Amino acid sequence: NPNYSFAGKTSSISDLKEVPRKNITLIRGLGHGEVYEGQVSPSPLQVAVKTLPEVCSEQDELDFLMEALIISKFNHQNIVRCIGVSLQSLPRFILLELMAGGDLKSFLRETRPRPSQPSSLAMLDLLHVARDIACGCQYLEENHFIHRDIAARNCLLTCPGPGRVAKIGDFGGCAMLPVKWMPPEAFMEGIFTSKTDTWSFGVLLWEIFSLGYMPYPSKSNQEVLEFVTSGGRMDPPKNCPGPVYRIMTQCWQHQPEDRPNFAIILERIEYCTQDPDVINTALPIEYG
Numbered sequence: 001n002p003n004y005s006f007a008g009k010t011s012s013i014s015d016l017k018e019v020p021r022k023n024i025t026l027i028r029g030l031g032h033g034e035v036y037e038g039q040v041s042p043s044p045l046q047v048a049v050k051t052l053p054e055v056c057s058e059q060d061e062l063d064f065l066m067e068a069l070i071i072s073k074f075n076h077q078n079i080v081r082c083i084g085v086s087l088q089s090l091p092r093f094i095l096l097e098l099m100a101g102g103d104l105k106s107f108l109r110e111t112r113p114r115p116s117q118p119s120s121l122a123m124l125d126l127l128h129v130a131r132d133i134a135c136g137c138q139y140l141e142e143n144h145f146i147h148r149d150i151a152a153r154n155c156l157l158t159c160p161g162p163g164r165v166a167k168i169g170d171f172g173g174c175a176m177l178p179v180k181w182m183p184p185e186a187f188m189e190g191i192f193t194s195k196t197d198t199w200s201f202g203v204l205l206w207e208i209f210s211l212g213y214m215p216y217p218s219k220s221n222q223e224v225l226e227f228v229t230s231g232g233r234m235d236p237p238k239n240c241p242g243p244v245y246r247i248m249t250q251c252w253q254h255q256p257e258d259r260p261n262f263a264i265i266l267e268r269i270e271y272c273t274q275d276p277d278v279i280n281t282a283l284p285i286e287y288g
């Protein structure tokens with residue numbers, strides 16, 4: 001039993017809300033540690049169920065428990081909820097707010113304006129997603145928590161249709177490191193502040209406004225590392241309003257001190273949202 005500290009409050013395995021296994025029913029797979037759609041029981045609660053493999057390392061067990069502690073203490077509308085856990089039966093479960101819209105990256109790619117559906121997305125949809133995540137990030141920042149992998153793949157959506165809400169819903173010899181989302185100083189002193197998350201948010205913004213493209217498309221991890229360290233920056237996504245691209249380039253200031261905090265990022269997203277020239281910009285139609 002390790003303890004976890006968040007907002008000056010310490011919690012352990014015993015503070016987690018244990019849900020009796022018999023109350024939990026798995027309905028279908030979602031992805032993969034595998035994830036299921038589930039329900040907890042007239043009016044059951046539908047949830048997502050993250051499982052721990054029964055045959056796993058000791059470190060796997062510890063990582064799984066620590067994750068549950070961390071997520072359970074987050075309390076914000078743009079961060080996916082932990083409903084409870086079921087650790088006293090095998091395989092062990094973590095129960096999460098079901099995000100029926102899936103991940104943001106897949107969504108953007110699938111919902112690109114095409115000849116089949118030319119009005120599938122608008123600029124305002126993108127700015128609302130951007131605002132939603134910025135709001136989750138500001139909460140993390142205010143509570144002195146650094147995420148380290150603010151990326152489209154780690155954002156989830158409440159529902160596929162309109163009225164969708166984006167939320168931070170996943171965490172991230174270094175071939176696994178999210179290099180394309182990391183600021184120059186991450187590789188230097190390896191130290192993290194919330195200005196790390198500011199940088200990654202700029203990359204997320206590029207991901208959002210490019211409609212789900214991989215950052216630095218023709219560049220590998222090491223190429224990106226050297227590019228970014230030498231001052232290299234991405235071009236604007238296709239049809240990207242200038243005001244939106246300026247948010248990205250401010251997030252990507254080499255000096256962390258010169259980067260905006262999330263309060264400032266939100267203000268600038270809001271000014272963009274109020275600009276008719278920005279929100280009336282047509283998104284590019286991908287040829288289908």
Ligand SMILES: COc1cc(Nc2nccc(N3CCC[C@H](C(=O)NCc4ccc(C)cc4)C3)n2)cc(OC)c1OC
Pocket residue numbers: 030031035048050071074079080096097098099100101102103156168169170171
């Ligand atoms: C529509 O189908 C999907 C639903 C979902 N919905 C969903 N809803 C809740 C959770 C969830 N997953 C899958 C991705 C990872 C996620 C997870 O383990 N989150 C842990 C976590 C980490 C940090 C924070 C702040 C919260 C939760 C669990 N997935 C996701 C999908 O792709 C990943 C889907 O496409 C197959």
